[PDB]
Amino acid sequence: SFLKEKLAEKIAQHRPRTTRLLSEFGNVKIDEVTISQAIGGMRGIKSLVTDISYLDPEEGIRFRGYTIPEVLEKLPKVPGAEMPYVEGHFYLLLTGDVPTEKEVKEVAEEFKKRRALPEYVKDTLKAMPRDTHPMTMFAAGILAMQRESKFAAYYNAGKFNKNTAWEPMFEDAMDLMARLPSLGAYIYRMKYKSDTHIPSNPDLDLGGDFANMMGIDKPYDDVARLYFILHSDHESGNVSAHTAHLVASALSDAYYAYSAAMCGLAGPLHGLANQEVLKWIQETIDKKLGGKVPTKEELKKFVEETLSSGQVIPGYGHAVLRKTDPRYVAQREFALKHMPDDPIFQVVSMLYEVVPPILSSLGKVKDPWPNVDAHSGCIQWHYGVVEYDFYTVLFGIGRALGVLANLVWDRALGYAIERPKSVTTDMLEKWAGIK
Amino acid sequence: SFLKEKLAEKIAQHRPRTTRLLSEFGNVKIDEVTISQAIGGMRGIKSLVTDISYLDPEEGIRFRGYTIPEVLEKLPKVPGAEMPYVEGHFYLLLTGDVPTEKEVKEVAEEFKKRRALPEYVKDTLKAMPRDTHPMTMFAAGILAMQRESKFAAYYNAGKFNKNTAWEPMFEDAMDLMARLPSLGAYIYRMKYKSDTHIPSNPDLDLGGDFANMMGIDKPYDDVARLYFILHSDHESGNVSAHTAHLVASALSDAYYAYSAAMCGLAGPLHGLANQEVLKWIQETIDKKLGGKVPTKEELKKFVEETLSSGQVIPGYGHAVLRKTDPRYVAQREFALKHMPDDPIFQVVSMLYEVVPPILSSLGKVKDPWPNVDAHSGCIQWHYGVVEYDFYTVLFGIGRALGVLANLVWDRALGYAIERPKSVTTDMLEKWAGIK
Amino acid sequence: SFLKEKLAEKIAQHRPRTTRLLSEFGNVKIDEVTISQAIGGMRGIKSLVTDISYLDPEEGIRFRGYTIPEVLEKLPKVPGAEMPYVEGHFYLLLTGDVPTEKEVKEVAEEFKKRRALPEYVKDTLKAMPRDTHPMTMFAAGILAMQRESKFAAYYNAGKFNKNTAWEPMFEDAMDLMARLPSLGAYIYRMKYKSDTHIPSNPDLDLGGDFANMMGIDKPYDDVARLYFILHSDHESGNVSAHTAHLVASALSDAYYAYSAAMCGLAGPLHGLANQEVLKWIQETIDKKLGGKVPTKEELKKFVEETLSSGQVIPGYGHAVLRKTDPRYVAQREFALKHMPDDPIFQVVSMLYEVVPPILSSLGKVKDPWPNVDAHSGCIQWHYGVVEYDFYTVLFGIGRALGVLANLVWDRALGYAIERPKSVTTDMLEKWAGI
Numbered sequence A, B: 001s002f003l004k005e006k007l008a009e010k011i012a013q014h015r016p017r018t019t020r021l022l023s024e025f026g027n028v029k030i031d032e033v034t035i036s037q038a039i040g041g042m043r044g045i046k047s048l049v050t051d052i053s054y055l056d057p058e059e060g061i062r063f064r065g066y067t068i069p070e071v072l073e074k075l076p077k078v079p080g081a082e083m084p085y086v087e088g089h090f091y092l093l094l095t096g097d098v099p100t101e102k103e104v105k106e107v108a109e110e111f112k113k114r115r116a117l118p119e120y121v122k123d124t125l126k127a128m129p130r131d132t133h134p135m136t137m138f139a140a141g142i143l144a145m146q147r148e149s150k151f152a153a154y155y156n157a158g159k160f161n162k163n164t165a166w167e168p169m170f171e172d173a174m175d176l177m178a179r180l181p182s183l184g185a186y187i188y189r190m191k192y193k194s195d196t197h198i199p200s201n202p203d204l205d206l207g208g209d210f211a212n213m214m215g216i217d218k219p220y221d222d223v224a225r226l227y228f229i230l231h232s233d234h235e236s237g238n239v240s241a242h243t244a245h246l247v248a249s250a251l252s253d254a255y256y257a258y259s260a261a262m263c264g265l266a267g268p269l270h271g272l273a274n275q276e277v278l279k280w281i282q283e284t285i286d287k288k289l290g291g292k293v294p295t296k297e298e299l300k301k302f303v304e305e306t307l308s309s310g311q312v313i314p315g316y317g318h319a320v321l322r323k324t325d326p327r328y329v330a331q332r333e334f335a336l337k338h339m340p341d342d343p344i345f346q347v348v349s350m351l352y353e354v355v356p357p358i359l360s361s362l363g364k365v366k367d368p369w370p371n372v373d374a375h376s377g378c379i380q381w382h383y384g385v386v387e388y389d390f391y392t393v394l395f396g397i398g399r400a401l402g403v404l405a406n407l408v409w410d411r412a413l414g415y416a417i418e419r420p421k422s423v424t425t426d427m428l429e430k431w432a433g434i435k
Numbered sequence C: 001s002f003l004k005e006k007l008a009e010k011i012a013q014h015r016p017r018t019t020r021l022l023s024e025f026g027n028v029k030i031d032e033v034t035i036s037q038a039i040g041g042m043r044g045i046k047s048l049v050t051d052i053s054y055l056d057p058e059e060g061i062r063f064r065g066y067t068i069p070e071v072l073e074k075l076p077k078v079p080g081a082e083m084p085y086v087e088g089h090f091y092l093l094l095t096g097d098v099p100t101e102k103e104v105k106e107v108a109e110e111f112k113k114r115r116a117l118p119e120y121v122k123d124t125l126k127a128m129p130r131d132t133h134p135m136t137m138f139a140a141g142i143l144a145m146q147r148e149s150k151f152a153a154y155y156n157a158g159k160f161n162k163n164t165a166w167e168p169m170f171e172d173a174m175d176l177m178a179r180l181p182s183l184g185a186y187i188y189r190m191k192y193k194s195d196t197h198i199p200s201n202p203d204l205d206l207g208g209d210f211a212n213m214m215g216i217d218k219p220y221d222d223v224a225r226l227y228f229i230l231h232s233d234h235e236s237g238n239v240s241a242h243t244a245h246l247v248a249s250a251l252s253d254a255y256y257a258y259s260a261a262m263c264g265l266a267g268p269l270h271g272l273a274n275q276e277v278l279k280w281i282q283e284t285i286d287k288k289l290g291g292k293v294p295t296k297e298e299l300k301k302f303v304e305e306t307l308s309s310g311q312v313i314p315g316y317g318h319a320v321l322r323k324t325d326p327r328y329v330a331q332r333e334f335a336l337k338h339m340p341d342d343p344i345f346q347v348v349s350m351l352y353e354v355v356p357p358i359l360s361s362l363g364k365v366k367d368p369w370p371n372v373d374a375h376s377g378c379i380q381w382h383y384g385v386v387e388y389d390f391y392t393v394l395f396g397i398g399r400a401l402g403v404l405a406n407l408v409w410d411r412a413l414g415y416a417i418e419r420p421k422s423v424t425t426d427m428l429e430k431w432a433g434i
């Protein structure tokens, strides 16, 4: 039972559905476009297809039909530790199936042999000024390893075949996913930990070895495992996942595609929310609460003034999520058990109480509820990841699991180039009756 | 006169129009989306807004409402050369106005002072293996300079505001546009010309200095002014312009945005058609045509043999264009004028006569006509730019002209994060009634 | 056809709206259900949805937003005649758009080629005893023709698709509507006019050909076009429209649905009032007015005798109307023009004046006002349609317009099987506290 073989089977079962949908039901209508939506970032238009994950606006994110709680129970657990192998979650995103112990082990052995970082990636990151933002460094590392692309080599030797193209894409995906934790770790060490490095430990799994290379003791190994599974995918319309998909649709390899994707995740409106919550809180705990865990009342009215004055409670909104986020939920369950007393956690817990009441009552706030990055930071800070800018790197490692899975499938199914049609301000004006 | 102040003026007049389309005419339907389109990468969906350029299927591209012939006619010319200052085209894309001679001079002077490459860019490209692909190097060079982003510093200093965000965007666009030719030339010299560098001549325009730094004599300066102007923009739905737009919509700076864009342009379905066309012609001449420019009738039968056996004619057709590309036309006039007796151009000319009737009869191709990529290669090769992989880097340099103008406007008008909605196969199958 | 794709166009726009209400606001309360209403036939419960027409208690019926005056006014008229093509009304009911002259003409051509009666319908009707009530013959004729159902043929060959199911429903609607007047007219000749049959004239409009085949001269053509439009629909909760809806909600075809429709319309409390009115007027005229148009006074006193004897003035009252029926209004307009001097009409007219005041001030009848069943009879009798039982067949042909339009949408919008919940008397007694 091997991943690539099983993946071939699933691809063989899935192709006729796609073919059918095109041949028999091509012109069936699924949505409309308004002036509002064209000007406003295609907001809400159903115009992309993925099966890796689906984001219900009411129910949370599902990974291959499963729920977060389901995924966390079903995936084989790392022995002597509490969370699943991340490699098992990748097996699941790739195939649709929960892996057995036996199947996880095989992927994890595969990751161990693909995990080493090319020495020239380090050369490049050293030549880039050390004051460069970690996400720029992370994107660069990815880009430089485009030299190693099996998909690019396949294409340039003239081997392109629409049926087999997924095979080198799968190879590139396994290689890149194996290496991202090492690349992130290297960036962490070189910028923030005095440029001393802890070697990869061949016996550890992906998340375990990330914790190791980061230089953080148990239970950070589980913090990482959980964090990456949680950030693994949020369907394909988020900017990072979409950016990867889009670039890849031109048959650019994954190195190009995921580098481009990290350029999107770097954006303040996409990858910064975890840290901005945490800085908001700390500052609140500082100025507005005399350096101390407050009480329910105090917090209740703190919100109201911040609201009344044209300010937003951070990490309590979202463009697609309309209910509470179950990624948020899994973080808590972890916090409640591992750091119940941590001062910062106590404030994110209490915030859970009041702020839904106030936005529900104030009105509007189409999403009057917490998204994941309302929680992620307090866990990181607890364990001594204080370097805020780096948080987005952790996001990038995680999000690759679903995006690279997605890229394999884009190629398996021959999804065509993404090339919408532009219109001018004048054209919109016509269609609106203006003159 | 001054570019920044005129740009301000144009923004302050445009902003109410967008406002109005949103405020009054928001839910006006402009298009619909079918199952075919979700699966077929959004083909045809009118879901993006730009005023920089507009791609008309029949007429091709208009830059700020001007046709290619009237752009080349109206833009101020470099003294002692045939072609316009690329800096003038840039002014036109930013403002909508055709600049006076005085107005281009001050854009040329501004670029002269923003032209120099950060030394660490050269350090970075040297650390990257020398056998790395030139587009990988080009993307990397761009990305490394994200360190200088005024937009990023502005955001990180807490200065973000929807009225002023265009300003540091413009500064970053000006900085980066000024340097892109030097970045490309550095890559050309370091890879292909023995790693000897020709210094910038502070007395040349962008086009002339690019030929200087490449080490190519007149009239390659004109080849470059024309090439870059023709490749400047193809509205915003093309993968590279779209990638930059999408990434910048999360408030990622132009460096992140344009590095991402070049990752998409790297793609064989986006940035390779030039070299692939040229290789095809040269191979065809060698094997099928006994190393000689054929007669009309000999080439008509080679085309049909090729079309009958399951092949395609490279550089013909397009996902949007439905008639002859006016970019192809402008390249032809240059070729006719400058290299009539060139063997490769001859085949290109004859192809232009022979191929459209044959493709039209068969009605396989929806655009049975050439695009620019049918023509660019023979001109490059004629002046001794024989390094096929580098052709795309020339594209990158040109395309930044419209894409960076576009990011400035995106920020001016406050266009929101791009976040369309994904649906699964199961969901398409439900909508199709095959639940 | 231009009709079929105009309709495809409306459906594709209207479906997201329906999904939205389901998907987002599906738990929003719309009304409540009291023991009274459960016992008394769902009286006043807002449990059905339709867009073909809406019945306002006060203003009465609107067809696709439009009132009766407006509909009569806007619909293309027949050359040489007063009234609209009924085809025109069908288009409007289907599409929602008032039709151009060309649009009306395309429906009329479509009906002219769909108009011919299967010979086995005639065989079946001849085998039914000639003394069978015309509504039974009517419902049987419809039912027999479910052999031709395209919608059924499409179900049986595995081709059902929730997106495409409206399309064969539409074909059947067009096939059946095109035939209903011919079926009606065959029943009329075979029973009442010596079993001799005037052929269909393929140059005539639906209503003109009906009168042609019935054997009645102008202006019976206009009587019919008017009659059919006015009876076209009365939203979906009336027993005939509801029966068809209910039956088709189980994905029975329109032949099954409308046959069932006509079984309900057959009922004394739904399709008989027109005739029961006209008889009672005839009686009264003969055995209470010395066979002559009374004075206003003579008749104001007659209404009270009858009432205070525990009798009802038929053709007045309604379970939903609460003011005067605009259907009644329109019939009256026609009468005043064409038959002012008719004795029976003159009593209908007088009645119009004296009955509401009495009924109002008695405070008993919740609709102290006429409905259309108060008027239709005098018109039919005036032109020599004396055969009382057959009136309800006229209603059937009429009411198909709106109901078959409605079934196309039911399938278009994919409405589920109508299946409410039953409760015992005991349970009602428990929710009463006994």
Ligand SMILES: O=C([O-])CC(=O)C(=O)O
Pocket: C233, C234, C237, C238, C239, C319, C320, C371
């Ligand atoms: O609406 C009702 O319940 C009865 C009626 O008047 C009609 O069917 O036209």
